[PDB]
Design a protein around this ligand. Structure first.
Ligand code: HEM
Ligand SMILES: [Ca+2]
Ligand SMILES: [Ca+2]
Length: 291
């Protein structure tokens, strides 16, 4: 039911308004492009791409689940974009669609590939912290659990390897990578540099780039890090670890276009997860609350 032309008559200037605002937000802080991409992932993996992650009224709660709390960001950017679009075409463009478009626009703004975003998603009237906890993968997962978690969303291992490349941009907090500092499959010089700003206890919120090579550029350097044992998260390095995914990591390191085309293929699949369409759900007037 999703269509790339969904708003071509009902809100002609929605997409260009979103583009201008996302480009400005990324220019203000490049990390924000990564944050918006991740926000769309955390939407789509939890009862579909339905903007459930944005609710923070009594119908919300996903923001307090372990994978999200103190970690997700960009809510204010999305709210600011939504208000701009509401001023142009009241109660027409869903928050769910804004998240998907903002993710694509963010990737492009940071040098990554474009793709066609199908539209027509509608906004949920509920949320699921329980499903956030069960369906979002934590960084201590091993490859087998990552494959299962993605397979439960009908994403295959290549989609896993390609979507993990989103970590070519953005940052992580010490509390989420400190375990990997001490593990056997990290380069020792790299591990020492991480330890300098990430203690074993305390400093939980100290940041490090997911991609030490180009933290603000959407490129295949994520994969060359893995080949050199400079993945940041445990779950990153699981992809190149005498494992079934090694040959795909090597391919994406040697063939940037193979990576970007696999990435758009997987992003389109992800953005097609369990949409509310037609008359299901609503068009929120404000993304943080149910009408
Ligand atoms: C494959 C399993 C994955 C795991 C275990 C994982 C885990 C994480 C963790 C722990 C962080 C750091 C959060 C923090 O410390 O606050 C992070 C950041 C990030 N993740 Fe993932 N992630 C995964 C897949 C994905 C996917 C599929 C996408 C998008 C397509 C994605 C996009 C991002 C981005 C862009 C950031 C940086 C966000 C920012 O700087 O604000 N990740 N991820
Ligand atoms: Ca959702
Ligand atoms: Ca990069």
């Amino acid at each position: 039911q999703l269509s790339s032309t969904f708003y071509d008559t009902s809100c002609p200037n929605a997409l260009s308004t979103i583009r201008s605002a996302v480009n400005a937000a990324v220019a203000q802080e490049n990390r924000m492009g990564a944050s918006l991409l991740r926000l769309h992932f955390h939407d789509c993996f939890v009862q579909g791409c339905d903007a459930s992650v944005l609710l923070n009224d009594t119908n919300g709660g996903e923001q307090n689940a372990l994978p999200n709390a103190g970690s997700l960001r960009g809510f204010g950017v999305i709210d600011n974009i939504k208000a701009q679009v509401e001023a142009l075409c009241p109660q027409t463009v869903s928050c769910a669609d804004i998240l998907a478009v903002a993710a694509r626009d963010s990737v492009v703004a940071l040098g990554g590939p474009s793709w066609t975003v199908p539209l027509g998603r509608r906004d949920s009237t509920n949320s699921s912290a329980a499903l956030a906890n069960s369906d979002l993968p934590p960084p201590q997962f091993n490859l087998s659990q990552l494959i299962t978690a993605f397979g439960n969303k009908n994403l295959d291992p290549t989609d896993l390897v390609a979507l993990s490349g989103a970590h070519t941009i953005g940052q992580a907090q010490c509390l989420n990578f400190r375990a990997h500092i001490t593990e056997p499959n990290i380069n020792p010089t790299f591990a020492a540099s991480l330890r300098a700003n990430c203690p074993a206890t305390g400093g939980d919120t100290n940041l490090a780039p997911l991609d030490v090579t180009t933290p603000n550029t959407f490129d295949n350097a994520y994969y060359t890090n893995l080949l050199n044992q400079r993945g940041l998260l445990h779950s990153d390095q699981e992809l190149f670890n005498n494992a079934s995914t090694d040959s795909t990591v090597r391919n994406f390191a040697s063939n940037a276009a193979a990576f970007t085309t696999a990435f758009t293929t997987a992003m389109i699949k992800m953005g097609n997860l369990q949409p509310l369409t037609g008359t299901q759900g609503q068009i929120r007037r404000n993304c943080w609350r149910v009408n």
